[PDB]
Design a protein around this ligand. Structure first.
Ligand SMILES: [Cl-]
Ligand SMILES: [Cl-]
Ligand SMILES: [Cl-]
Ligand SMILES: [Mg+2]
Ligand code: NA
Ligand code: NI
Length: 226
């Protein structure tokens, strides 16, 4: 999309809009044997999730089904107001997208996903859960994230972006899965967008690409493709 980083809170009210909600019945995976989807976050690893995202499992975690015997209770009032997670959508600059999608440059795609992954690692630092010892807020440093890459390869305004869906869950010290306290995540949108931006530029520069910096806005794009 147009925003460098958009953050969309998913609830029961808007869940059918979330990336990954729909799937083809004949397939277990949206994109088996590719990197269009991936599980990320230390929480994902704690759940034994890695590699391609299985659609059924994504949908279970969306609504807090850790397993058949373990359904999260994330409610304090109206049932439709339950937060299911947060879509952190990272979109590449226009020239970067054109190089990736029109010129078919796989290096760019790799750089973009490394940049998303770095921003996800930063987001993890903001993971928190409420505990009772007296209410106590615990830094848990783990998220469960399902990423979906979208390659809008239209000649008119190519758009490379990845939806990094952060589940509304985090594993506490006691091993218990609880809802994320999203305060820190929410107030760090600009910071996370800049982590993605800086890391993307670093990766492209390392790979040898010439970038053009806009000094007024402190942004960048490809030197010849913008
Ligand atoms: Cl999504
Ligand atoms: Cl990375
Ligand atoms: Cl919250
Ligand atoms: Mg992905
Ligand atoms: Na742009
Ligand atoms: Ni999309």
């Amino acid at each position: 999309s147009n925003a460098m980083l958009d953050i969309t809170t998913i609830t029961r009210q808007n869940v059918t809009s979330v990336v990954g909600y729909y799937s083809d019945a004949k397939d277990d995976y949206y994109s088996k044997d590719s990197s269009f989807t991936s599980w990320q976050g230390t929480g994902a690893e704690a759940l034994g999730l890695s590699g391609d995202v299985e659609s059924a499992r994504f949908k279970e975690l969306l609504v807090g089904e850790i397993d058949t015997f373990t359904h999260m209770q994330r409610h304090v009032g109206d049932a439709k107001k339950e937060r299911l997670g947060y879509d952190l959508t990272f979109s590449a600059p226009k020239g970067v997208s054109m190089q990736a999608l029109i010129h078919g440059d796989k290096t760019i795609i790799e750089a973009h996903e490394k940049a998303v992954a770095a921003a996800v690692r930063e987001a993890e630092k903001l993971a928190q859960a409420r505990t009772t010892r007296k209410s106590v807020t615990q830094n848990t440093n783990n998220l469960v994230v399902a990423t979906f890459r979208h390659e809008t390869s239209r000649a008119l305004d190519p758009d490379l972006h990845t939806h990094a869906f952060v589940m509304n869950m985090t594993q506490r010290e006691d091993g218990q899965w609880r809802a994320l306290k999203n305060d820190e995540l929410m107030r760090n949108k600009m910071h996370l967008g800049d982590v993605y931006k800086q890391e993307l530029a670093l990766e492209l520069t390392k790979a040898g690409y010439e970038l053009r910096y806009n000094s007024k806005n402190n942004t960048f794009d490809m030197a010849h493709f913008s």
